[PDB]
């Protein structure tokens, strides 16, 4: 089918300036109790999740260092250590990961 007549700027306006086509204001926006940045109420803080992600990555590298193959994965639970720490009896008998950074604020010792 072929359009019979050029449409007006009026008609075009009322089509694409229509409220249903508009970008609505999201009202679930809040601030992070931690870093005072912003996140939607139901979603993790991007920034905090970032600190996390980085740390996780480094850990995974250092546990790719203790592993000498593509297929070699431990049969024991593992735990991570930081400057100035020691395996407890509860946590000994497990694979240990020795990292350089001091134990971060958010990360607990457990």
């Amino acid at each position: 089918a072929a359009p019979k007549n050029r449409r007006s700027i009026e008609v075009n306006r009322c089509r694409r300036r229509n409220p249903q086509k508009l970008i609505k204001v999201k009202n679930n926006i809040d601030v992070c109790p931690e870093c005072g940045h912003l996140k939607q109420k139901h979603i993790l803080c991007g920034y905090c999740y970032e600190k996390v992600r980085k740390e996780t990555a480094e850990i995974r590298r250092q546990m790719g260092k203790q592993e000498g193959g593509p297929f070699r994965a431990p049969t024991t639970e593992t735990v991570v250590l930081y400057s100035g720490e020691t395996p407890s009896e509860q946590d000994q008998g497990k694979r240990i990961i020795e990292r350089e950074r001091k134990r971060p604020s958010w990360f607990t010792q457990n």
Partner: protein, 153 residues
């Protein structure tokens, strides 16, 4: 019409979606925490959860074993399933898994992304949401109702 359908249709078809979930489950069971597409993860969660109740059936059970054979691609991973993952889950029936929604991917496609995890993995704690503390004016206003529900009983 979809009424009462329990599965989302992913990948090239039925079998494809299954091998998709194969990889996702493999990765979950190796790395213990993964982020991926919300639907794919939400979907996977069921599989991740029941795999652990196969693990709970012991290294000896045959059904459970070839099950994990199929469902874990790196064969290396099958021990970690029975020896590691399954025993550290005993008391908790179904509480294996944390799945949360992460900010939308920063690629141009901008998908809706989640992260999925085995509780009691050794990894940095996900920055979960906390409830408000009990010093908050509102909760505090409820502790009064609380103690006066104790005092009239």
């Amino acid at each position: 019409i979809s009424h009462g359908r329990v599965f989302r249709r992913l990948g090239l078809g039925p079998e494809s979606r299954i091998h998709l979930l194969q990889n996702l489950l493999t990765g979950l069971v190796r790395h213990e925490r993964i982020e991926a597409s919300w639907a794919r993860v939400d979907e996977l969660r069921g599989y991740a959860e029941k795999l652990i109740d196969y693990g709970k059936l012991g290294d000896t059970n045959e059904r459970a074993m070839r099950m994990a054979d199929f469902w874990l691609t790196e064969k290396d991973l099958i021990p970690k399933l029975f020896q590691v993952l399954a025993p550290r889950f005993q008391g908790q029936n179904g509480g294996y898994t944390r799945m949360l929604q992460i900010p939308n991917r920063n690629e141009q496609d901008r998908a809706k992304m989640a992260v999925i995890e085995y509780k009691g993995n050794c990894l940095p704690p996900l920055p979960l949401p906390r409830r408000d503390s009990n010093l908050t004016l509102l909760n505090q206003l409820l502790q009064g109702l609380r103690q006066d529900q104790e005092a009239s009983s």
